[PDB]
Design a protein around this nucleic acid. Structure first.
Ligand SMILES: [Mg+2]
Length: 693
RNA sequence: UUUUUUUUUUUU
């Protein structure tokens, strides 16, 4: 007897769809398994309990369910590509010969059966012994077939990624999950490279604008090796300034349809991890020839504006190929120190090649900072949205183990660079959209989804607050009132929920959207925007560089609307996967940090302060702002606790202990919890407990 | 575990 029911016929499925019985939506399987939801955007979402009702479906699988808000899967319309199944292997029947038991890291993926002695590195006689010997080794499996007469599918074990306790092996496994190429560059791509001893041609120096003698700097963080941006300011004889943005001319090295170009389009973006980084381009270009290192002549595209003390564009812009030699390289911290009024030797402490005096650079930094402050105030006043977001910055020891973990605050220098990069991006977008209105690669951000914003508004209604989503400007105004209404940590949580409410930003080809009103950036309130200020780490910036060059030459776009759409979609998906990878890396290093804290301070958990976001059934969702993480204190897992009572309103929960001290805690209350890195389960899992371990 | 929304922007 088949464990699962047969998928209905195509005609029967269509008939049921016209009969209101059948339904169609995406599927989201929950981490705790057995529980899944048919994600229907309009009609109420449906629930699914048990893999029997799941009928051999996976996460993000567009499926056709039938009501049996519960429902049974009867047809799969589309399957999302399962990018590898990394995990571990356990002996058959582990506390007995049989098929090997593969356990994926994603709990959403069911167990897998590895056929009799299926392997190459541990297959043969004594296979069980080899499994046990390599039990603490992460491996990877592929799916081969799922027999309806088996509750689990089957699959071949791939390459052994390696020690689970090895951070780098876990990293390689995570890369494998989201399909990010960690292999070295192909020898043909290296053959595409120019000679390493390439020198600046006098012909090219005359063909371009010679800004070498100018004062140009690169404000980038301390741990930066690929420099793309360069800012400059020019005091004009009147009250105005000529501000310039200079971006490494990668397209001068990367030529269309070359093997280098193909690998760049394949990787789409540079993936940045905590301990290392996967580059999009080979290091010769990414770290030497194109990187805007100090005191080196470099070929770069440049955009100039004429702005007043308020930052309004008074004079005509200028676009063109230039050759520049940056006066100095700066860190964001040192730039902030300069802005705060300190002396160059007290903050930066670097030599400034050229006639440029220290006070010249100081004046330039302060001028650019004031202009950037004015432009940021105007941008937010125009209708933009201010979200600070969260990111976990780690300081590592010589061995790579996390010694420090902290939240990142953006100082005024960060916004200084940010505003001018945004200005450059917007100007380039406007120009290339005006010229090549059919084959232009820009970025868009539509209005937020009504569903998420309604949920967030109801959450604020629970906290007796109203959010006007009628406009981005009203959204930001409600955010400001909220910040002036609650404590800063609650406000941080609210910013988290706000960024959740936003819609996914995406690249696009102007030809696909007939109406120009659809080319808009809701959060930035811009009418035109693209990515152009980072061509060494975002292939869309390479495409935009080529489009800008052609627009200055008034020639053809050289790229087809369809091909442009392909590049846009591929790069959007690659950016999704890269974001996920970086977040998971941060999570991994946070777990290792908690483990090191427990080891050094002779405890089993780290004590932290947390705010109670939700009180449901037998658990409480808590947010730890010190590390910007959302965990759950399971009232059931707390066996040390004696009992509890949740009221029908879920706004307060009373607690009773064995020492008979009863005490009640409500929503948005600040209380202490403990974070511990559970390694007893198969993989790294940060868990939170109310009681100290 | 067994009820769910994880996406603005800069730099890296
Ligand atoms: Mg930079």
């Amino acid at each position: 007897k088949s464990v699962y029911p047969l998928y209905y016929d195509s005609a029967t499925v269509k008939k049921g769809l016209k009969s209101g019985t059948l339904f169609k939506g995406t599927l989201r399987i929950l981490e705790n398994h057995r529980s899944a939801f048919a994600c229907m955007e309009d009609i109420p979402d449906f629930y699914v309990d048990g893999p029997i009702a799941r009928n051999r479906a996976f996460h993000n699988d567009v499926v056709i369910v039938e009501p049996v808000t519960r429902a049974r899967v009867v047809a799969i319309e589309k399957r999302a590509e399962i990018s590898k199944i990394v995990g571990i292997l356990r002996a058959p029947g582990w506390s007995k010969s049989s098929y090997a038991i593969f356990i994926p890291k994603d709990k959403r993926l069911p167990f897998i059966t590895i056929h009799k002695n299926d392997l190459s590195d541990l297959s043969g006689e004594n296979w069980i012994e080899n499994i046990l010997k390599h039990h603490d080794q992460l491996f990877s499996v592929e799916i081969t077939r799922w027999s309806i007469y088996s509750r689990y599918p089957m699959g071949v074990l791939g390459e052994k990624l390696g020690n689970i306790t090895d951070v780098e092996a876990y990293t390689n496994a995570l890369l494998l999950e989201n399909g990010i190429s960690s292999s070295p560059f192909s020898d043909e791509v290296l053959n595409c490279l120019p000679p390493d001893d390439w020198i600046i041609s006098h012909e090219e120096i005359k063909k371009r604008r010679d800004l070498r003698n100018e004062l140009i700097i690169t404000i980038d963080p301390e741990t930066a090796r690929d420099l793309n941006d360069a800012v400059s300011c020019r005091a004009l004889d009147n009250g105005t300034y000529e501000v310039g943005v200079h971006i490494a001319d990668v397209t001068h090295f990367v030529k269309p349809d070359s093997a280098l170009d193909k690998e760049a389009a394949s990787r789409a973006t540079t993936v940045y991890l905590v301990q290392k980084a996967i580059p999009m381009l080979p290091p010769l270009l990414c770290e030497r020839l194109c990187s805007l290192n100090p005191n080196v002549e470099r070929l770069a595209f440049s955009v100039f504006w004429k702005l007043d003390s308020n930052g309004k564009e008074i004079g005509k812009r200028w676009f063109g190929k230039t050759v520049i030699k940056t006066c100095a390289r700066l860190a964001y911290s040192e730039a902030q120190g300069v802005i705060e009024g300190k002396s160059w030797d007290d903050a930066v402490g670097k030599p400034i090649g050229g006639t440029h005096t220290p006070k010249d650079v100081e004046t330039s930094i302060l001028t650019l900072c004031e202009i950037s402050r004015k432009l940021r105030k105007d941008r937010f006043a125009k209708g933009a949205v201010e979200i600070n977001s969260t990111e976990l910055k780690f300081q590592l020891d010589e061995y790579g183990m996390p010694n420090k973990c902290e939240v990142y605050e953006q100082t005024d220098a960060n916004h200084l660079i940010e505003e001018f990069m945004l200005l450059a991006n917007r100007s380039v977008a406007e120009h290339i959209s005006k010229n090549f209105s059919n084959n232009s690669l820009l970025r868009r951000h539509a209005s937020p989804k009504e569903k998420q914003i309604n949920e967030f508004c109801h959450f604020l209604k629970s906290m007796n607050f109203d959010f006007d989503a009628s406009s981005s400007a009203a959204f930001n105004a409600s955010m400001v009132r909220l910040r002036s209404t609650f404590n800063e940590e609650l406000v941080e949580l609210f910013e988290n929920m706000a960024v959740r409410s936003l819609n996914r930003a995406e690249y696009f080809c102007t030809g696909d959207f007939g109406e120009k009103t659809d080319w808009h950036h809701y959060a930035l309130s811009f009418n035109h925007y693209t990515h152009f200020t980072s061509p060494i780490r975002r292939y869309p910036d390479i495409i935009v560089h080529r489009l800008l060059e052609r627009s200055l030459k008034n020639t053809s776009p050289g790229i087809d609307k369809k091909n442009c759409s392909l590049v846009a979609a591929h790069c959007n998906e690659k950016k999704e996967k890269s974001t996920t990878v970086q977040e998971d890396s941060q999570q991994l290093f946070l777990s290792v940090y908690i483990a090191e804290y427990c080891k050094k301070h002779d405890k089993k958990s780290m004590p932290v302060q947390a705010f109670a976001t939700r009180i449901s059934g037998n658990s409480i969702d808590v947010y730890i702002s010190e590390y910007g993480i959302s965990n759950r204190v399971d009232l059931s897992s707390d066996d040390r606790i004696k009992s509890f009572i949740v009221a029908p309103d879920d706004s307060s929960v009373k607690i009773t202990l064995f020492d008979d001290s009863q005490k009640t805690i409500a929503l948005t209350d600040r209380f202490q919890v403990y974070l511990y890195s559970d390694y007893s389960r198969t993989f790294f899992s940060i868990r939170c407990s109310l009681v100290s371990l």
